[PDB]
Design a binder for this molecule. Structure first.
Ligand code: HEM
Length: 396
């Protein structure tokens, strides 16, 4: 499974990390990745796993490579949708996406998000147990997308099925099939709303402009597809990491119960500690980067997760401290592809925590349960069995 070391890569830089099955995974996925930040590991390493690729291990280099788009291209953004894989066009497509998921939209949507969170939590509250990942986290971001995009509730099971196939296929559909079925769904809606628009995200995208002309159907379906898939697994898994931590740390949980005003700052610290994305780039040319010779076409993993875990960026980085004066991270990325959904995601997180902690303040991991993580481009939580006494809860 280890690809022989290419002639340009010096042996002293080899560290055979497997981003899909890291050695230390039972200890927690962030901890498993943090092996890359041990003192005997260089700032930039080559792994022979997954075909062989570079890994930047420190926030300084991860940030720099994301800034240097001329050398570090998004044409191959994953080891091994618009605008993921691309500057003048990129800027225009992002401006358009900001029209639909920017702060003003999020601020308008906030109480609808709260109303949805409340309905979900209240459905679970009297049971005294749930698998948080399946029972709250999975249904939540897809419903928020339907709100954002003005799509009917009845379309959820099929749309959720298609997005599930793109990331966790059961085998019924190839990636290409699931993507094309998503496009089959979106195309007539985009066409309809181009001619008769509302104020929803699809209407706004369908009526956008690029290079002085109307957005095409192909461009619009790809933008809408990315806005859909981008906010699903990231939010599901991130909420799950946060809730796992809160279930296991009654002291931190109590801090947020007593001082709910600290929740937004707590969100940011959790985003740092339980960061979860690890994307990459491809070298456009031969390039010497921090004393290391990179070759045209080499792939480089630039884990967003690692920047905030770097003790050079944050002291005692594995400790959760809601009062940190400066929370440094790249959890939503850095540079020209910075997450478009970051404002919506923060609001979903904060609303979820606020509503959960006021309705179900006291909860624990089910006894005997060992929470399992998974690793990859979006790392996550396989399941989160929680238990609580319903008499300690507050009903609608
Ligand atoms: C905790 C939640 C989220 C996290 C951690 C996250 C993380 C990221 C990261 C790291 C990137 C940059 C990827 C790269 O440079 O290779 C990104 C891009 C993106 N995200 Fe998110 N994301 C989250 C939620 C969302 C949501 C809710 C949406 C949609 C509403 C969304 C839509 C997008 C889109 C469209 C891009 C591509 C931007 C571009 O290429 O210009 N994300 N996200």
């Amino acid at each position: 499974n280890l690809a022989p070391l290419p002639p340009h890569v010096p042996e002293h830089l080899v560290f055979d990390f497997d981003m899909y099955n890291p050695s230390n995974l039972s200890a927690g996925v962030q901890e498993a990745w943090a092996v890359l930040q041990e003192s005997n590991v260089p700032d930039l390493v080559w792994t022979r796993c997954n075909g062989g690729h570079w890994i930047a291990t420190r926030g300084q280099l991860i940030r720099e490579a994301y800034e240097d788009y001329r050398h570090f291209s998004s044409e191959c953004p994953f080891i091994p949708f618009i605008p993921t894989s691309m500057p003048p066009e990129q800027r225009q497509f992002r401006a358009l996406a900001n029209q639909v998921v920017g702060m003003p939209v999020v601020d308008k949507l906030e109480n609808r998000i709260q109303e949805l969170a409340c309905s979900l939590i209240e459905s679970l509250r009297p049971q005294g147990q749930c698998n948080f990942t399946e029972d709250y986290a999975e249904p939540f971001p897809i419903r928020i997308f339907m709100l954002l995009a003005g799509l009917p509730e009845e379309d959820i099971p099929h749309l959720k099925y298609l997005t599930d196939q793109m990331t966790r296929p059961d085998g019924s559909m190839t990636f290409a099939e699931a993507k094309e079925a998503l496009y089959d769904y979106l195309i007539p809606i985009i066409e309809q709303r181009r001619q008769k628009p509302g104020t929803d995200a699809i209407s706004i995208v369908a009526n956008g402009q690029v290079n002085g002309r109307p957005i095409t159907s192909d461009e619009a379906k790809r933008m809408c597809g990315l806005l859909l898939v981008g906010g699903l697994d990231t939010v599901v898994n991130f909420l799950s990491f946060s809730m796992e931590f809160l279930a296991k740390s009654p002291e931190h949980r109590q801090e947020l119960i007593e001082r709910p005003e600290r929740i937004p700052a707590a969100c940011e610290e959790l985003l740092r500690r339980f960061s979860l994305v690890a994307d990459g780039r491809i070298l456009t040319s031969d390039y010497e980067f921090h004393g290391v010779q990179l070759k045209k076409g080499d792939q480089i993993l630039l884990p967003q997760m690692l920047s905030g875990l770097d003790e050079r960026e944050n002291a005692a980085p594995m400790h959760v401290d809601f009062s940190r004066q400066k929370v440094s991270h790249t959890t939503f990325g850095h540079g020209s592809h910075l997450c478009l959904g970051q404002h919506l995601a923060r609001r979903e997180i904060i609303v979820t925590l606020k509503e959960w902690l006021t309705r179900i303040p006291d909860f624990s991991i089910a006894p005997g349960a060992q929470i399992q993580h998974k690793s990859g481009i979006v790392s996550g939580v396989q399941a989160l069995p929680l238990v609580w006494d319903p008499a300690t809860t507050k009903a609608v």
